Amino acid sequence: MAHPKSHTNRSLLRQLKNTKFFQSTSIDWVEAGLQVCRQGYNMLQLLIHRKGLTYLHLDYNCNLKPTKTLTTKERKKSRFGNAFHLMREILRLTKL
Amino acid sequence: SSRKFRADKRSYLGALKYLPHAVLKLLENMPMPWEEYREVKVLYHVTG
Amino acid sequence: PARKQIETRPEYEMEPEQPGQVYNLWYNKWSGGMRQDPLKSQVKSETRCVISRDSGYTKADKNPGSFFCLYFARGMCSEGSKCEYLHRLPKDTDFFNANVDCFGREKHADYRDDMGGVGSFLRQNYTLYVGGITPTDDIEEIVSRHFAEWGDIERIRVLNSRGIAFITYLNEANAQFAKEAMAHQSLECLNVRWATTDPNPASQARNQRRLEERAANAVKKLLPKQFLLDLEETKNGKXXXXXXXXXXXXXXXXXXXXXXX
Amino acid sequence: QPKSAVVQQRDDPVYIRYTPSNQMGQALSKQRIIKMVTAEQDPMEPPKFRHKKVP
RNA sequence: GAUCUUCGGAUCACUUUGGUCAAAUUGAAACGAUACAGAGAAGAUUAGCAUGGCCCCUGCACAAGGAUGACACUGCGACAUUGAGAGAAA
RNA sequence: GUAUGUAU
Ligand SMILES: [Mg+2]
Ligand SMILES: [Mg+2]
Ligand SMILES: [Mg+2]
Ligand SMILES: [Mg+2]
Q: Could you give the residue ranges of the DSSP H alpha helices within chain C? A: 36-39, 51-54, 59-62, 70-74, 139-150, 172-182, 201-220, 225-237, 240-250, 253-260
Helices C139-150 and C172-182, axial angle in degrees (round to 10): 120
Among positive and negative, which fits the CA dihedral A24, A27, A32, A33?
Answer: positive
* Count of C-beta atoms within a 10 Å radius of residue A82: 7
Distance CA C132, CA C202 (A): 26
Residue D9 CB burial class (10 angstroms; 0-12, 13-18, ≥19): exposed
CA distance from start to end of chain A? 34
User: Would the Cβ of A25 be found within 7 angstroms of any atom in strand F?
Assistant: no
Nearest-Cα distance to chain B for C106, in Å, is 18
Spell out which residues of chain B touch residue C28, defining contact as CB-CB under 8 Å: 1-3, 6
Burial (0-12, 13-18, 19+ Cβ within 10 Å), C192: buried
CB proximity A69–strand F (7 Å threshold):
no
Beta C129-131 vs D14-17: how paired, if at all?
A: unpaired
Cα angle: C146, vertex C148, C149; to 5 degrees: 70
* Spatial contact of B40 and B27, defined as CB atoms under 8 Å apart: no
DSSP-derived secondary structure for C69-137: -HHHHHT--SSGGG-SSB-S---SS----TTB-TTS-B-BSS--SS--SS-BSSS-----EEE----SS
> Could you check: is the Cβ of residue C59 within 7 Å of any atom of nucleic acid strand E?
no
Q: Nearest-CA neighbor of C74 among C39, C32, C105, C44?
A: C44
What technique solved it? cryo-EM
Nearest to B11 among D4, D5, D42 (CB): D42
Please check whether residue C157 is in contact with residue C207, taking contact to mean a CB–CB distance below 8 angstroms: no
Round and report the angstrom distance from CA (A4) to C1' (E43).
Answer: 73
Give residue A76 CA to ligand 1 midpoint distance, Å: 15
- CB of B34 within 8 Å of a chain A CB? The answer is no
Residue type, C120: S
CB atoms B39 and A91 under 8 Å: no
Asked if residue A76 keeps its beta carbon closer than 7 A to nucleic acid strand F, the reply is yes
Residues C65 and B28: their CA atoms lie apart, in Å, by 57
Kindly provide the resolution of this structure in angstroms, with one decimal: 3.6
Distance D55 CA to E41 C1' (A): 33
Contacts B12 to D, Cβ<8 Å: 44
For chain A, positions 21-40, list CB contacts with chain D under 8 A: 21
Query: Taking a C-beta distance cutoff of 8 angstroms, is the pair C86, C54 a contact?
Result: no
Say which DSSP state A26 is in. -
Named by the residue before each, gaps in chain B exceeding 2.5 A from C to N are none
- What gap in Å lies between CA C164 and CA C171, rounded to an integer? 22
Contact residues, chain D, for A21 at CB < 8 Å: 42-44
CA of C106 to C1' of E20 (A): 9
Nearest partner of B10 among B40, B35, B47, judged by Cα: B47
Beta bridge partners of C106: C100
Nucleic strand E near CB of residue C104 (< 7 Å): yes
Phi-psi region of A69 (alpha: psi -120 to 50; beta: other; left: phi over 0): left
Which are the residues after which chain C is interrupted (C to N > 2.5 Å)? 187, 238, 251
Cα distances (angstroms) measured from residue C6 to each of C70, C75, D31: 14, 9, 50
Q: Cβ contacts (< 8 Å) between A10 and chain B: which residues?
A: none
Residue A54, nucleotide of least CA–C1' distance: E31
Decide if B16 touches A, using CB distance below 8 A.
Answer: yes
Q: How far is the CA of A72 from the C1' of E44 (A)?
A: 29
